[PDB]
Design a protein around this nucleic acid. Structure first.
Ligand SMILES: [K+]
Ligand SMILES: [K+]
Ligand SMILES: [K+]
Ligand SMILES: [K+]
Ligand SMILES: [K+]
Ligand SMILES: [K+]
Ligand SMILES: [K+]
Ligand SMILES: [K+]
Ligand SMILES: [K+]
Ligand SMILES: [K+]
Ligand SMILES: [K+]
Ligand SMILES: [K+]
Ligand SMILES: [K+]
Ligand SMILES: [Mg+2]
Ligand SMILES: [Mg+2]
Ligand SMILES: [Mg+2]
Ligand SMILES: [Mg+2]
Ligand SMILES: [Mg+2]
Ligand SMILES: [Mg+2]
Ligand SMILES: [Mg+2]
Ligand SMILES: [Mg+2]
Ligand SMILES: [Mg+2]
Ligand SMILES: [Mg+2]
Ligand SMILES: [Mg+2]
Ligand SMILES: [Mg+2]
Ligand SMILES: [Mg+2]
Ligand SMILES: [Mg+2]
Ligand SMILES: [Mg+2]
Ligand SMILES: [Mg+2]
Ligand SMILES: [Mg+2]
Ligand SMILES: [Mg+2]
Ligand SMILES: [Mg+2]
Ligand SMILES: [Mg+2]
Ligand SMILES: [Mg+2]
Ligand SMILES: [Mg+2]
Ligand SMILES: [Mg+2]
Ligand SMILES: [Mg+2]
Ligand SMILES: [Mg+2]
Ligand SMILES: [Mg+2]
Ligand SMILES: [Mg+2]
Ligand SMILES: [Mg+2]
Ligand SMILES: [Mg+2]
Ligand SMILES: [Mg+2]
Ligand SMILES: [Mg+2]
Ligand SMILES: [Mg+2]
Ligand SMILES: [Zn+2]
Lengths: 91, 114, 251, 68, 134
RNA sequence: CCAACUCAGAACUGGUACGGACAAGGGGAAUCCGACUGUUUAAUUAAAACAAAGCAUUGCGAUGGUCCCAACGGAUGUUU
RNA sequence: AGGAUUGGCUCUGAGGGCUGG
RNA sequence: GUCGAUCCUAAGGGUCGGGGGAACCCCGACAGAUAGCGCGUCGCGCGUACUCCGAAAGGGAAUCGGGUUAAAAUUCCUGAACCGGGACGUGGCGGUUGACGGCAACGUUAGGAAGUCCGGAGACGUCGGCGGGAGCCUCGGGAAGAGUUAUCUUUUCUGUUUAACAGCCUGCCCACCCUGGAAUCGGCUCAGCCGGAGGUAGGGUCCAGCGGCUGGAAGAGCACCGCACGUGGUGUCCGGUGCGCUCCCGGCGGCCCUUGAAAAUCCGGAGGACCGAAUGCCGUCCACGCCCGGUCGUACUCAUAACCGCAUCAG
């Protein structure tokens, strides 16, 4: 059954800390505890070991990523920015 | 029921003060200190155990106290790398060396272009 | 009066940094011939957590240039680094995330981290999680480079200074609320003895300029001048302004 | 303490120069031959009583034989 | 079938001779009755010859030119085929029946040793007699 | 052939007694203060006081900010 | 918040394991 | 010699040189021709300024039953083992100079080697669920003694033992190997979860043990019945049960802006300079035999009377 209408994973905090802080922390609470796709082996077996560290259970590849997500938004932009600069220099 | 006491002057339940209860031929229970658990050899990266070697305290591996066959594996990097790891290195060494030969030859054909 | 809390920190004692479990200083290789002229290949062996440091660290193994032995290094991990990756350091290293290049070889607009201030100092700028520096322009005549630091300040550095391509991994750490005094306790337990903080207005006059009074209140401007002596310099030090930063001020 | 499984092996160790003594222990179902050497006490078990008597008189002279 | 044929140099990947170079003597792609998998009979080098240099004396050079070989049956999955070839006559010296008896195996190894050493001294097939480093 | 103890129901029965001793929340409608857990005047004050997460302001890019030191030097700093 | 039940005794039902083609 | 101190390093402490200081003193390897080590036989090679102190709860070579005193014992007695050193002898092993077996995981008791280099062990948080081992608790039968007995009670009670160490067997939960090639997807946990990066299945390897058997070892211990006032005999047996309790281990999962010591020491590996014999020398981490074992602590209380509180103090 549906055990909580909206609280979800932040139900472990009971009635403490205020709704906004529970709502705010829910995004990162879900993301840091979720499985992520491993580009190396192709499995959804990447989980956070510590803040910024993401290891694949299957192939054993350990990757440095975001604090609470494997890939941050700025990380994608940096890769494309660096790629564009490399092409011009390597032209 | 019979209750026990430490047989030494160590009075605190530290990891090195572990014990087992033994019943002697005299019909009484007594403690005998048990050595801590040991990990045994493990692979440098994956951390999996190295097969064929028992798990003992470091001093128990001393050559005088352990037969040679129990602390060795008959293979290159035996006791240090698993069989899979050794296989990976051998193939990598051969294939990478072959690729170097291809690079060397490939640049000789272009060097003469003039 | 007595020595205030701010003054007691300089003596060390119970205010020294908690460094028992730290893995060591994170820094580039020592500048040598290989990095000055060509490039040297390294391999990432593991990405580890350093207590008290948000950014993860990377252990890299290098082949020693002239000795028969391995050369171990500890780098601040850039976002995207992974174990088994090849890392190239030197003047002729390609522009890819993780490589360490001199600023002279890095084009304008690139994102870099752990930027050296002095050639060979092994990295002092943009080392915290999610932080980076942006290369602005090059000055071939002076042999210097302009970079934008995380605080938004522009600085001149010699073009020989090295920098790692990319941003520091672990970004977004501070967005998550702590929610608990205990979480703050664990955060500062591995940093130093700075938490919790008692407000000066809650103390007695003997131990703080803000102390005392039949009501809790400062009683004088909390903005203190730059040249105030230790023990008097509390509050907003040399404040150019105060109050909510609205408009262009918060730029 | 070590156990000898072959009567031939027991005789060989009984002729060692460090074999101080031999003791005969007769149980209700077998006979145990125990020889005290420098490092170990070697024991041989002989279930057949008649087969044990033959070994008893085949021990080298000069070795202290005792019955338990 | 195509490249796993006699005189084809291979590298052992498992067992106590992992990393050793060997040459196929007989190939069993279909697999014998006792072994229902692809395997071959190989004659490899258990001990590579040392580095032979001019400054060494004649007696010293002779010892450093010694080779020691092994005869073995190996699964196809436990060898790495190479593009190199070693054309040494071993059809009569090395056979499946040889491995049955220890005395026969020793004689074949000694005979295989003689043919590897003479080939090594000619300066040909330097790769085969060179130790693989990994 | 060998099994351990959980649950449910029924009949009968005692002077309605039966969580029989032991054990073991009184409850409700509201106001004030502090969000909460935590801490505090050892030996008269445990609180509405302190701390707290959150929020905001200030200084500082190392030839630096803050601080210690008679001097030399040092803490923050294995830091950015 | 509010309400009901609770002993003793004699029974009934339900919930298992290992062997045997 | 076997329990500790002793050894190792932790937070830190004490210091050389140097820099300060009237000096007492301050900083503390930071201003510097380190300490020395290794291999040959005095020479070569290496060589980053502490061979220091700092744990009777961290790390760590090796001892177990039985017996013994008015008062001591893992220290004394007896028996049985082990550890670290030293020295040579006998036998065995290797020479295709440096073993053999297995497709493999790996197995076997031996089975070259220097400078140099590399890895591992030592070595690690916390919580929760499961599984395994040991001790205890508990149920039934057999035999031994005791208690109850006007009545009832094939009943109630006490016990009914097996050390280190050595060999062999077993092979948990995992990990690993071979064959083979999977959708009608299957396997699988309490929970997960796993599989063309090779599942299920079939057959293997390895690892744990505080598991089994034997030796140790019944000759001991205990109980009981005698004879004398030391000595003999009998027994010590066969099963069941578990969300049970204590300890240990295994494996999995949860938690962190917290990721939860170091060093001594030990093991393994990469490399192969150099080295024997034409078969007698060389090599040998194998078996057996021989010798050696420092110094200090060790009684007793550990508390409503042996510590502190003025005390034989309800703290
Ligand atoms: K082994
Ligand atoms: K003062
Ligand atoms: K504090
Ligand atoms: K405060
Ligand atoms: K005030
Ligand atoms: K509480
Ligand atoms: K400073
Ligand atoms: K100690
Ligand atoms: K520890
Ligand atoms: K004893
Ligand atoms: K023992
Ligand atoms: K004593
Ligand atoms: K008292
Ligand atoms: Mg997988
Ligand atoms: Mg605050
Ligand atoms: Mg006050
Ligand atoms: Mg004042
Ligand atoms: Mg009101
Ligand atoms: Mg409150
Ligand atoms: Mg208090
Ligand atoms: Mg008070
Ligand atoms: Mg009070
Ligand atoms: Mg608010
Ligand atoms: Mg000064
Ligand atoms: Mg000891
Ligand atoms: Mg220290
Ligand atoms: Mg001093
Ligand atoms: Mg001095
Ligand atoms: Mg120095
Ligand atoms: Mg020392
Ligand atoms: Mg010391
Ligand atoms: Mg200790
Ligand atoms: Mg005593
Ligand atoms: Mg380790
Ligand atoms: Mg919890
Ligand atoms: Mg259990
Ligand atoms: Mg299988
Ligand atoms: Mg026995
Ligand atoms: Mg007896
Ligand atoms: Mg406990
Ligand atoms: Mg070697
Ligand atoms: Mg005593
Ligand atoms: Mg007493
Ligand atoms: Mg006591
Ligand atoms: Mg006093
Ligand atoms: Zn992966």
């Amino acid at each position: 059954t549906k055990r909580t209408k909206k609280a979800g994973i932040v139900g472990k905090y009971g009635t403490r800390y205020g709704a906004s802080l529970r709502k705010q922390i829910k995004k990162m609470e879900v993301s840091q505890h979720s499985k992520y796709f491993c580009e190396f082996c192709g499995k959804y077996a990447v989980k956070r070991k510590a803040v910024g560290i993401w290891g694949c259970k299957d192939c054993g590849k350990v990757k440095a990523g975001g604090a609470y997500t494997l890939n941050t938004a700025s990380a994608v932009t940096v890769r494309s920015t660096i790629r564009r600069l490399r092409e011009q220099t390597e032209s | 029921v019979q209750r026990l006491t430490y047989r030494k002057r160590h009075s605190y339940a530290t990891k090195s003060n572990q014990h087992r209860v033994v019943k002697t031929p005299g019909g009484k229970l007594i403690y005998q200190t048990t050595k801590k658990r040991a990990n045994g050899p493990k692979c440098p990266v994956t951390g999996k155990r190295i097969q064929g070697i028992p798990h003992l305290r470091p001093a128990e591996y001393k050559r005088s106290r352990l037969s040679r066959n129990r602390r060795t594996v008959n293979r290159a990097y035996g006791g240090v790398l698993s069989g899979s790891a050794v296989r990976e290195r051998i193939i990598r060494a051969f294939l990478v060396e072959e690729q170097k030969i291809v690079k060397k030859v490939l640049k000789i054909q272009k060097a003469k272009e003039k | 009066g007595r020595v205030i809390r701010a003054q007691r920190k300089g003596a060390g004692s119970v205010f020294k940094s908690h460094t028992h479990h730290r893995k060591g200083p994170a820094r580039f290789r020592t500048l040598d011939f290989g990095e000055r002229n060509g490039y040297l290949k390294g391999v990432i062996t593991e990405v580890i957590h350093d207590p008290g440091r948000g950014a993860p660290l990377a252990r890299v193994t290098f082949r020693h240039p002239f000795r028969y032995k391995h050369q171990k290094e500890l780098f601040v991990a850039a976002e995207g680094m992974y174990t088994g990756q090849f890392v190239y350091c030197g003047k002729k290293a390609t522009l890819m995330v993780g490589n360490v290049l001199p600023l002279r070889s890095i084009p304008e607009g690139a994102v870099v981290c752990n930027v050296e201030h002095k050639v060979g100092d092994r990295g002092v700028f943009a080392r915290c999680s999610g932080d980076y520096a942006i290369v602005i322009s090059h000055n071939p005549d002076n042999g210097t480079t302009r970079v934008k630091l995380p605080s938004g300040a522009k600085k001149i550095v010699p073009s020989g200074c090295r920098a790692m391509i990319g941003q520091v991994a672990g970004g977004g750490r501070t967005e998550k609320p702590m929610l608990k005094a205990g979480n703050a306790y664990h955060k500062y337990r591995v940093k130093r003895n700075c938490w919790p903080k008692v407000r000066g207005v809650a103390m007695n006059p003997v131990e703080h300029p803000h102390g005392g009074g039949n009501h809790q209140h400062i009683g004088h401007a909390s903005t203190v001048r730059r040249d105030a002596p230790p023990g008097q310099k509390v509050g907003l030090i040399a404040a150019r302004r105060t109050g909510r930063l609205r408009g262009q001020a918060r730029a | 303490p070590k156990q000898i499984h072959e009567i031939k092996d027991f005789l060989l160790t009984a002729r060692r120069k460090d074999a101080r003594t031999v003791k005969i222990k007769k149980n209700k179902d077998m006979v145990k031959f125990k020889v005290r050497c420098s490092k170990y006490l070697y024991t041989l078990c002989v279930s057949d009583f008649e087969k044990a008597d033959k070994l008893k008189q085949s021990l080298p002279p000069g070795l202290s034989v005792q019955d338990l | 079938v195509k490249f796993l044929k006699p005189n084809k140099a291979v590298i052992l990947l498992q067992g106590k001779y992992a990393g050793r170079k060997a040459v196929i003597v007989r190939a069993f792609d279909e697999g014998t009755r006792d072994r229902p998998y692809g395997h071959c009979l190989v004659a490899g080098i258990s001990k590579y010859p040392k580095k032979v240099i001019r400054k060494d004396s004649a007696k010293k050079q002779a010892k450093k030119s010694r080779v020691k070989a092994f005869i073995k049956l190996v699964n196809y999955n436990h060898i790495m085929p190479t593009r190199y070839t070693l054309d040494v006559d071993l059809k009569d010296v090395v056979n499946a029946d040889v491995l049955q008896a220890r005395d026969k195996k020793v004689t074949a190894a000694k005979e295989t040793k003689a043919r590897f050493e003479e080939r090594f001294k000619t300066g040909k097939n330097r790769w085969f007699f060179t130790k693989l480093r990994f």
